[PDB]
Amino acid sequence: HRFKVYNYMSPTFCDHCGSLLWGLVKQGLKCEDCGMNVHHKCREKVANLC
Amino acid sequence: HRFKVYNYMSPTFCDHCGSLLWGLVKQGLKCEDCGMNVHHKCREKVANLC
Ligand SMILES: CC(=O)O[C@@]12[C@H](O)[C@@H](C)[C@@]3(O)[C@@H](C=C(CO)C[C@]4(O)C(=O)C(C)=C[C@@H]34)[C@@H]1C2(C)C
Ligand SMILES: CC(=O)O[C@@]12[C@H](O)[C@@H](C)[C@@]3(O)[C@@H](C=C(CO)C[C@]4(O)C(=O)C(C)=C[C@@H]34)[C@@H]1C2(C)C
Ligand SMILES: [Zn+2]
Ligand SMILES: [Zn+2]
Ligand SMILES: [Zn+2]
Numbered sequence: 001h002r003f004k005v006y007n008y009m010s011p012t013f014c015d016h017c018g019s020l021l022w023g024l025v026k027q028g029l030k031c032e033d034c035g036m037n038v039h040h041k042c043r044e045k046v047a048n049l050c
Numbered sequence: 051h052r053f054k055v056y057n058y059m060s061p062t063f064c065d066h067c068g069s070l071l072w073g074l075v076k077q078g079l080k081c082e083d084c085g086m087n088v089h090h091k092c093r094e095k096v097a098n099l100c
């Protein structure tokens with residue numbers, strides 16, 4: 001995965017843990033290749049294979 | 051047009067005046083119906099028909 005911080009425009013959940021990507025900006029990281037969305041705290045918890 | 055503030059993820063220009071939508075967040079307003087992107091200052095300058 002190529003995770004880069006993303007500022008989300010509508011409520012998006014973390015594809016790893018299920019909770020909302022909280023906040024007004026920079027709520028989480030979206031993988032540039034597959035679109036997976038994770039919380040900053042959940043990025044270390046995701047498997048590496050994209 | 052239904053313009054709402056948008057936080058852009060890559061350099062986007064104003065569809066009205068041609069300059070970059072400056073800034074890290076809330077750089078401009080994107081029309082929810084047609085995707086037109088404008089600077090906060092250019093919204094008053096756009097024609098109403100979408
Ligand atoms: C139109 C729109 O929903 O814009 C927003 C709303 O104002 C806001 C209530 C929002 O929908 C938000 C998007 C995300 C992402 O997960 C997170 C939130 O801010 C959030 O924590 C809650 C509880 C609602 C989410 C985005 C933005 C642009 C801040
Ligand atoms: C990957 C990426 O380009 O992210 C960014 C870059 O860090 C940054 C240099 C950027 O590309 C930016 C998007 C826009 C919109 O017009 C405005 C800018 O911040 C800007 O003023 C300049 C001079 C580059 C633009 C977005 C974000 C997410 C802040
Ligand atoms: Zn991926
Ligand atoms: Zn999570
Ligand atoms: Zn429009």
Ligand SMILES: [Zn+2]
Binds near residue numbers: 088
């Ligand atoms: Zn403009």
